[PDB]
């Protein structure tokens, strides 16, 4: 599996998911984290997460 | 059910949903790098997100702050 990082990368043996994670910096302003993972991350109360499992689905 | 409908400059508005609208939603629509307008309101079916977005759906009062 290949996931976006910023740049891209190939995930560890057991990592079959790419993620996007909206972290709030201020009103209307969110820092979006992207990368490989094995378990879909939990979202912040004021955030949102999207998880997918094909090559760089997480553009 | 009561859901948030708009949020701007510290003030929010809310509303009571119709009989068949049993979910509140948040919808991240992209305006620029790291810049998102979050749409909020009542709905009956949770909407699909834009390819470049994200959606959160909940069903308690003003869950969608």
PDB file of N, CA, C and O in Angstrom, chain A residues 1-11 15 17-23 25 30-41 48-52 54-59, chain B residues 28-36 50-54:
ATOM      1  N   UNK A   1       0.828  -1.202   0.000  1.00  0.00           N
ATOM      2  CA  UNK A   1       0.000   0.000   0.000  1.00  0.00           C
ATOM      3  C   UNK A   1       0.867   1.258   0.000  1.00  0.00           C
ATOM      4  O   UNK A   1       1.912   1.309   0.651  1.00  0.00           O
ATOM      5  N   UNK A   2       0.429   2.266  -0.750  1.00  0.00           N
ATOM      6  CA  UNK A   2       1.099   3.557  -0.831  1.00  0.00           C
ATOM      7  C   UNK A   2       0.147   4.634  -0.335  1.00  0.00           C
ATOM      8  O   UNK A   2      -1.011   4.684  -0.763  1.00  0.00           O
ATOM      9  N   UNK A   3       0.624   5.484   0.571  1.00  0.00           N
ATOM     10  CA  UNK A   3      -0.196   6.549   1.132  1.00  0.00           C
ATOM     11  C   UNK A   3       0.521   7.886   0.989  1.00  0.00           C
ATOM     12  O   UNK A   3       1.754   7.961   1.020  1.00  0.00           O
ATOM     13  N   UNK A   4      -0.273   8.944   0.823  1.00  0.00           N
ATOM     14  CA  UNK A   4       0.254  10.303   0.829  1.00  0.00           C
ATOM     15  C   UNK A   4       0.762  10.658   2.219  1.00  0.00           C
ATOM     16  O   UNK A   4       0.196  10.235   3.237  1.00  0.00           O
ATOM     17  N   UNK A   5       1.845  11.434   2.269  1.00  0.00           N
ATOM     18  CA  UNK A   5       2.450  11.867   3.522  1.00  0.00           C
ATOM     19  C   UNK A   5       2.468  13.377   3.716  1.00  0.00           C
ATOM     20  O   UNK A   5       2.433  13.831   4.862  1.00  0.00           O
ATOM     21  N   UNK A   6       2.529  14.162   2.641  1.00  0.00           N
ATOM     22  CA  UNK A   6       2.565  15.619   2.760  1.00  0.00           C
ATOM     23  C   UNK A   6       1.913  16.311   1.565  1.00  0.00           C
ATOM     24  O   UNK A   6       2.167  15.963   0.413  1.00  0.00           O
ATOM     25  N   UNK A   7       4.655  14.313  -0.842  1.00  0.00           N
ATOM     26  CA  UNK A   7       5.513  13.155  -0.616  1.00  0.00           C
ATOM     27  C   UNK A   7       4.651  11.941  -0.290  1.00  0.00           C
ATOM     28  O   UNK A   7       3.538  12.079   0.223  1.00  0.00           O
ATOM     29  N   UNK A   8       5.162  10.748  -0.601  1.00  0.00           N
ATOM     30  CA  UNK A   8       4.439   9.504  -0.376  1.00  0.00           C
ATOM     31  C   UNK A   8       5.380   8.471   0.241  1.00  0.00           C
ATOM     32  O   UNK A   8       6.589   8.691   0.351  1.00  0.00           O
ATOM     33  N   UNK A   9       4.816   7.329   0.638  1.00  0.00           N
ATOM     34  CA  UNK A   9       5.589   6.288   1.307  1.00  0.00           C
ATOM     35  C   UNK A   9       4.839   4.964   1.232  1.00  0.00           C
ATOM     36  O   UNK A   9       3.636   4.925   0.959  1.00  0.00           O
ATOM     37  N   UNK A  10       5.578   3.878   1.465  1.00  0.00           N
ATOM     38  CA  UNK A  10       5.031   2.524   1.506  1.00  0.00           C
ATOM     39  C   UNK A  10       4.886   2.069   2.957  1.00  0.00           C
ATOM     40  O   UNK A  10       5.817   2.215   3.756  1.00  0.00           O
ATOM     41  N   UNK A  11       3.725   1.510   3.285  1.00  0.00           N
ATOM     42  CA  UNK A  11       3.369   1.187   4.662  1.00  0.00           C
ATOM     43  C   UNK A  11       4.028  -0.101   5.159  1.00  0.00           C
ATOM     44  O   UNK A  11       4.381  -0.995   4.382  1.00  0.00           O
ATOM     45  N   UNK A  15       0.101  -2.686   7.837  1.00  0.00           N
ATOM     46  CA  UNK A  15      -0.633  -1.436   7.662  1.00  0.00           C
ATOM     47  C   UNK A  15      -1.338  -1.430   6.309  1.00  0.00           C
ATOM     48  O   UNK A  15      -0.694  -1.307   5.262  1.00  0.00           O
ATOM     49  N   UNK A  17      -4.203   0.620   5.654  1.00  0.00           N
ATOM     50  CA  UNK A  17      -5.091   1.775   5.611  1.00  0.00           C
ATOM     51  C   UNK A  17      -4.266   3.051   5.473  1.00  0.00           C
ATOM     52  O   UNK A  17      -3.220   3.198   6.114  1.00  0.00           O
ATOM     53  N   UNK A  18      -4.744   3.976   4.638  1.00  0.00           N
ATOM     54  CA  UNK A  18      -4.312   5.369   4.607  1.00  0.00           C
ATOM     55  C   UNK A  18      -5.351   6.219   5.334  1.00  0.00           C
ATOM     56  O   UNK A  18      -6.541   5.893   5.334  1.00  0.00           O
ATOM     57  N   UNK A  19      -4.907   7.315   5.952  1.00  0.00           N
ATOM     58  CA  UNK A  19      -5.807   8.178   6.707  1.00  0.00           C
ATOM     59  C   UNK A  19      -5.608   9.646   6.359  1.00  0.00           C
ATOM     60  O   UNK A  19      -4.528  10.062   5.923  1.00  0.00           O
ATOM     61  N   UNK A  20      -6.683  10.419   6.547  1.00  0.00           N
ATOM     62  CA  UNK A  20      -6.654  11.873   6.638  1.00  0.00           C
ATOM     63  C   UNK A  20      -7.253  12.277   7.978  1.00  0.00           C
ATOM     64  O   UNK A  20      -8.300  11.756   8.372  1.00  0.00           O
ATOM     65  N   UNK A  21      -6.615  13.222   8.667  1.00  0.00           N
ATOM     66  CA  UNK A  21      -7.063  13.630   9.995  1.00  0.00           C
ATOM     67  C   UNK A  21      -7.101  15.148  10.095  1.00  0.00           C
ATOM     68  O   UNK A  21      -6.057  15.805  10.029  1.00  0.00           O
ATOM     69  N   UNK A  22      -8.302  15.694  10.289  1.00  0.00           N
ATOM     70  CA  UNK A  22      -8.511  17.135  10.406  1.00  0.00           C
ATOM     71  C   UNK A  22      -8.288  17.551  11.855  1.00  0.00           C
ATOM     72  O   UNK A  22      -9.109  17.248  12.727  1.00  0.00           O
ATOM     73  N   UNK A  23      -7.201  18.271  12.111  1.00  0.00           N
ATOM     74  CA  UNK A  23      -6.919  18.815  13.430  1.00  0.00           C
ATOM     75  C   UNK A  23      -7.128  20.322  13.395  1.00  0.00           C
ATOM     76  O   UNK A  23      -6.598  21.012  12.519  1.00  0.00           O
ATOM     77  N   UNK A  25      -6.906  24.166  14.068  1.00  0.00           N
ATOM     78  CA  UNK A  25      -5.984  25.204  14.511  1.00  0.00           C
ATOM     79  C   UNK A  25      -6.705  26.482  14.906  1.00  0.00           C
ATOM     80  O   UNK A  25      -6.195  27.246  15.730  1.00  0.00           O
ATOM     81  N   UNK A  30      -7.800  24.128   9.585  1.00  0.00           N
ATOM     82  CA  UNK A  30      -7.558  22.749   9.994  1.00  0.00           C
ATOM     83  C   UNK A  30      -6.255  22.255   9.382  1.00  0.00           C
ATOM     84  O   UNK A  30      -6.012  22.453   8.188  1.00  0.00           O
ATOM     85  N   UNK A  31      -5.432  21.596  10.196  1.00  0.00           N
ATOM     86  CA  UNK A  31      -4.219  20.937   9.724  1.00  0.00           C
ATOM     87  C   UNK A  31      -4.530  19.471   9.442  1.00  0.00           C
ATOM     88  O   UNK A  31      -4.895  18.723  10.354  1.00  0.00           O
ATOM     89  N   UNK A  32      -4.353  19.058   8.189  1.00  0.00           N
ATOM     90  CA  UNK A  32      -4.745  17.733   7.717  1.00  0.00           C
ATOM     91  C   UNK A  32      -3.528  16.820   7.734  1.00  0.00           C
ATOM     92  O   UNK A  32      -2.583  17.007   6.961  1.00  0.00           O
ATOM     93  N   UNK A  33      -3.545  15.830   8.618  1.00  0.00           N
ATOM     94  CA  UNK A  33      -2.498  14.819   8.666  1.00  0.00           C
ATOM     95  C   UNK A  33      -2.827  13.648   7.748  1.00  0.00           C
ATOM     96  O   UNK A  33      -3.984  13.234   7.637  1.00  0.00           O
ATOM     97  N   UNK A  34      -1.797  13.125   7.083  1.00  0.00           N
ATOM     98  CA  UNK A  34      -1.933  12.026   6.136  1.00  0.00           C
ATOM     99  C   UNK A  34      -0.790  11.048   6.347  1.00  0.00           C
ATOM    100  O   UNK A  34       0.334  11.454   6.646  1.00  0.00           O
ATOM    101  N   UNK A  35      -1.076   9.751   6.203  1.00  0.00           N
ATOM    102  CA  UNK A  35      -0.028   8.762   6.275  1.00  0.00           C
ATOM    103  C   UNK A  35      -0.598   7.347   6.326  1.00  0.00           C
ATOM    104  O   UNK A  35      -1.796   7.136   6.145  1.00  0.00           O
ATOM    105  N   UNK A  36       0.308   6.404   6.554  1.00  0.00           N
ATOM    106  CA  UNK A  36      -0.024   5.000   6.758  1.00  0.00           C
ATOM    107  C   UNK A  36      -0.453   4.750   8.200  1.00  0.00           C
ATOM    108  O   UNK A  36      -0.127   5.508   9.114  1.00  0.00           O
ATOM    109  N   UNK A  37      -1.180   3.651   8.393  1.00  0.00           N
ATOM    110  CA  UNK A  37      -1.574   3.189   9.718  1.00  0.00           C
ATOM    111  C   UNK A  37      -2.105   1.767   9.600  1.00  0.00           C
ATOM    112  O   UNK A  37      -2.417   1.291   8.505  1.00  0.00           O
ATOM    113  N   UNK A  38      -2.168   1.084  10.744  1.00  0.00           N
ATOM    114  CA  UNK A  38      -2.756  -0.248  10.839  1.00  0.00           C
ATOM    115  C   UNK A  38      -4.181  -0.225  11.367  1.00  0.00           C
ATOM    116  O   UNK A  38      -4.976  -1.105  11.020  1.00  0.00           O
ATOM    117  N   UNK A  39      -4.511   0.751  12.208  1.00  0.00           N
ATOM    118  CA  UNK A  39      -5.850   0.954  12.742  1.00  0.00           C
ATOM    119  C   UNK A  39      -6.268   2.385  12.443  1.00  0.00           C
ATOM    120  O   UNK A  39      -5.472   3.314  12.619  1.00  0.00           O
ATOM    121  N   UNK A  40      -7.510   2.570  12.002  1.00  0.00           N
ATOM    122  CA  UNK A  40      -7.960   3.909  11.653  1.00  0.00           C
ATOM    123  C   UNK A  40      -7.945   4.775  12.917  1.00  0.00           C
ATOM    124  O   UNK A  40      -8.422   4.335  13.966  1.00  0.00           O
ATOM    125  N   UNK A  41      -7.378   5.974  12.852  1.00  0.00           N
ATOM    126  CA  UNK A  41      -7.236   6.772  14.079  1.00  0.00           C
ATOM    127  C   UNK A  41      -8.564   7.333  14.555  1.00  0.00           C
ATOM    128  O   UNK A  41      -9.486   7.579  13.774  1.00  0.00           O
ATOM    129  N   UNK A  48     -12.389  15.443  12.269  1.00  0.00           N
ATOM    130  CA  UNK A  48     -12.962  14.462  11.355  1.00  0.00           C
ATOM    131  C   UNK A  48     -11.826  13.625  10.788  1.00  0.00           C
ATOM    132  O   UNK A  48     -10.698  14.107  10.652  1.00  0.00           O
ATOM    133  N   UNK A  49     -12.131  12.365  10.469  1.00  0.00           N
ATOM    134  CA  UNK A  49     -11.142  11.429   9.947  1.00  0.00           C
ATOM    135  C   UNK A  49     -11.756  10.693   8.767  1.00  0.00           C
ATOM    136  O   UNK A  49     -12.941  10.345   8.787  1.00  0.00           O
ATOM    137  N   UNK A  50     -10.946  10.455   7.744  1.00  0.00           N
ATOM    138  CA  UNK A  50     -11.320   9.594   6.635  1.00  0.00           C
ATOM    139  C   UNK A  50     -10.267   8.514   6.437  1.00  0.00           C
ATOM    140  O   UNK A  50      -9.070   8.809   6.385  1.00  0.00           O
ATOM    141  N   UNK A  51     -10.718   7.271   6.296  1.00  0.00           N
ATOM    142  CA  UNK A  51      -9.834   6.126   6.135  1.00  0.00           C
ATOM    143  C   UNK A  51     -10.215   5.329   4.896  1.00  0.00           C
ATOM    144  O   UNK A  51     -11.396   5.185   4.579  1.00  0.00           O
ATOM    145  N   UNK A  52      -9.208   4.872   4.158  1.00  0.00           N
ATOM    146  CA  UNK A  52      -9.423   4.192   2.890  1.00  0.00           C
ATOM    147  C   UNK A  52      -8.287   3.185   2.722  1.00  0.00           C
ATOM    148  O   UNK A  52      -7.310   3.212   3.473  1.00  0.00           O
ATOM    149  N   UNK A  54      -6.858   1.854  -0.651  1.00  0.00           N
ATOM    150  CA  UNK A  54      -6.215   1.688  -1.950  1.00  0.00           C
ATOM    151  C   UNK A  54      -5.117   2.735  -2.083  1.00  0.00           C
ATOM    152  O   UNK A  54      -5.018   3.660  -1.274  1.00  0.00           O
ATOM    153  N   UNK A  55      -4.300   2.587  -3.129  1.00  0.00           N
ATOM    154  CA  UNK A  55      -3.050   3.332  -3.228  1.00  0.00           C
ATOM    155  C   UNK A  55      -3.298   4.833  -3.210  1.00  0.00           C
ATOM    156  O   UNK A  55      -3.889   5.389  -4.139  1.00  0.00           O
ATOM    157  N   UNK A  56      -2.813   5.487  -2.154  1.00  0.00           N
ATOM    158  CA  UNK A  56      -2.945   6.934  -1.988  1.00  0.00           C
ATOM    159  C   UNK A  56      -4.372   7.415  -2.236  1.00  0.00           C
ATOM    160  O   UNK A  56      -4.597   8.509  -2.755  1.00  0.00           O
ATOM    161  N   UNK A  57      -5.344   6.582  -1.880  1.00  0.00           N
ATOM    162  CA  UNK A  57      -6.729   7.009  -1.728  1.00  0.00           C
ATOM    163  C   UNK A  57      -6.867   8.317  -0.944  1.00  0.00           C
ATOM    164  O   UNK A  57      -7.830   9.069  -1.142  1.00  0.00           O
ATOM    165  N   UNK A  58      -5.927   8.594  -0.040  1.00  0.00           N
ATOM    166  CA  UNK A  58      -6.063   9.694   0.920  1.00  0.00           C
ATOM    167  C   UNK A  58      -5.478  11.006   0.403  1.00  0.00           C
ATOM    168  O   UNK A  58      -4.936  11.785   1.191  1.00  0.00           O
ATOM    169  N   UNK A  59      -5.568  11.293  -0.896  1.00  0.00           N
ATOM    170  CA  UNK A  59      -5.057  12.557  -1.444  1.00  0.00           C
ATOM    171  C   UNK A  59      -5.637  13.791  -0.739  1.00  0.00           C
ATOM    172  O   UNK A  59      -6.835  13.856  -0.449  1.00  0.00           O
TER     173      UNK A  59
ATOM    174  N   UNK B  28     -17.136  19.147   5.801  1.00  0.00           N
ATOM    175  CA  UNK B  28     -15.944  19.946   5.529  1.00  0.00           C
ATOM    176  C   UNK B  28     -15.803  20.118   4.018  1.00  0.00           C
ATOM    177  O   UNK B  28     -15.522  19.152   3.302  1.00  0.00           O
ATOM    178  N   UNK B  29     -16.024  21.336   3.527  1.00  0.00           N
ATOM    179  CA  UNK B  29     -15.818  21.667   2.122  1.00  0.00           C
ATOM    180  C   UNK B  29     -14.616  22.594   1.988  1.00  0.00           C
ATOM    181  O   UNK B  29     -14.503  23.583   2.722  1.00  0.00           O
ATOM    182  N   UNK B  30     -13.721  22.265   1.053  1.00  0.00           N
ATOM    183  CA  UNK B  30     -12.417  22.913   0.967  1.00  0.00           C
ATOM    184  C   UNK B  30     -12.497  24.241   0.221  1.00  0.00           C
ATOM    185  O   UNK B  30     -13.013  24.306  -0.898  1.00  0.00           O
ATOM    186  N   UNK B  31     -11.969  25.297   0.843  1.00  0.00           N
ATOM    187  CA  UNK B  31     -11.858  26.611   0.224  1.00  0.00           C
ATOM    188  C   UNK B  31     -10.436  26.976  -0.175  1.00  0.00           C
ATOM    189  O   UNK B  31     -10.257  27.822  -1.056  1.00  0.00           O
ATOM    190  N   UNK B  32      -9.433  26.384   0.465  1.00  0.00           N
ATOM    191  CA  UNK B  32      -8.045  26.627   0.163  1.00  0.00           C
ATOM    192  C   UNK B  32      -7.182  25.745   1.041  1.00  0.00           C
ATOM    193  O   UNK B  32      -7.698  24.936   1.818  1.00  0.00           O
ATOM    194  N   UNK B  33      -5.857  25.860   0.926  1.00  0.00           N
ATOM    195  CA  UNK B  33      -4.968  25.035   1.767  1.00  0.00           C
ATOM    196  C   UNK B  33      -5.262  25.249   3.243  1.00  0.00           C
ATOM    197  O   UNK B  33      -5.170  26.367   3.755  1.00  0.00           O
ATOM    198  N   UNK B  34      -5.636  24.163   3.925  1.00  0.00           N
ATOM    199  CA  UNK B  34      -5.948  24.136   5.354  1.00  0.00           C
ATOM    200  C   UNK B  34      -7.175  24.965   5.713  1.00  0.00           C
ATOM    201  O   UNK B  34      -7.419  25.212   6.901  1.00  0.00           O
ATOM    202  N   UNK B  35      -7.942  25.427   4.727  1.00  0.00           N
ATOM    203  CA  UNK B  35      -9.058  26.345   4.943  1.00  0.00           C
ATOM    204  C   UNK B  35     -10.349  25.649   4.531  1.00  0.00           C
ATOM    205  O   UNK B  35     -10.542  25.334   3.353  1.00  0.00           O
ATOM    206  N   UNK B  36     -11.231  25.410   5.502  1.00  0.00           N
ATOM    207  CA  UNK B  36     -12.450  24.642   5.289  1.00  0.00           C
ATOM    208  C   UNK B  36     -13.659  25.364   5.858  1.00  0.00           C
ATOM    209  O   UNK B  36     -13.609  25.904   6.967  1.00  0.00           O
ATOM    210  N   UNK B  50     -17.416  15.236  -0.135  1.00  0.00           N
ATOM    211  CA  UNK B  50     -16.659  15.517  -1.348  1.00  0.00           C
ATOM    212  C   UNK B  50     -15.352  14.748  -1.309  1.00  0.00           C
ATOM    213  O   UNK B  50     -14.787  14.511  -0.240  1.00  0.00           O
ATOM    214  N   UNK B  51     -14.831  14.427  -2.495  1.00  0.00           N
ATOM    215  CA  UNK B  51     -13.588  13.665  -2.586  1.00  0.00           C
ATOM    216  C   UNK B  51     -12.491  14.267  -1.717  1.00  0.00           C
ATOM    217  O   UNK B  51     -11.668  13.540  -1.152  1.00  0.00           O
ATOM    218  N   UNK B  52     -12.466  15.596  -1.598  1.00  0.00           N
ATOM    219  CA  UNK B  52     -11.471  16.312  -0.811  1.00  0.00           C
ATOM    220  C   UNK B  52     -11.994  16.745   0.558  1.00  0.00           C
ATOM    221  O   UNK B  52     -11.408  17.639   1.179  1.00  0.00           O
ATOM    222  N   UNK B  53     -13.090  16.149   1.027  1.00  0.00           N
ATOM    223  CA  UNK B  53     -13.706  16.559   2.277  1.00  0.00           C
ATOM    224  C   UNK B  53     -13.851  15.502   3.355  1.00  0.00           C
ATOM    225  O   UNK B  53     -13.148  14.488   3.355  1.00  0.00           O
ATOM    226  N   UNK B  54     -14.779  15.738   4.280  1.00  0.00           N
ATOM    227  CA  UNK B  54     -15.052  14.808   5.366  1.00  0.00           C
ATOM    228  C   UNK B  54     -16.413  15.152   5.962  1.00  0.00           C
ATOM    229  O   UNK B  54     -16.833  16.312   5.939  1.00  0.00           O
TER     230      UNK B  54
END
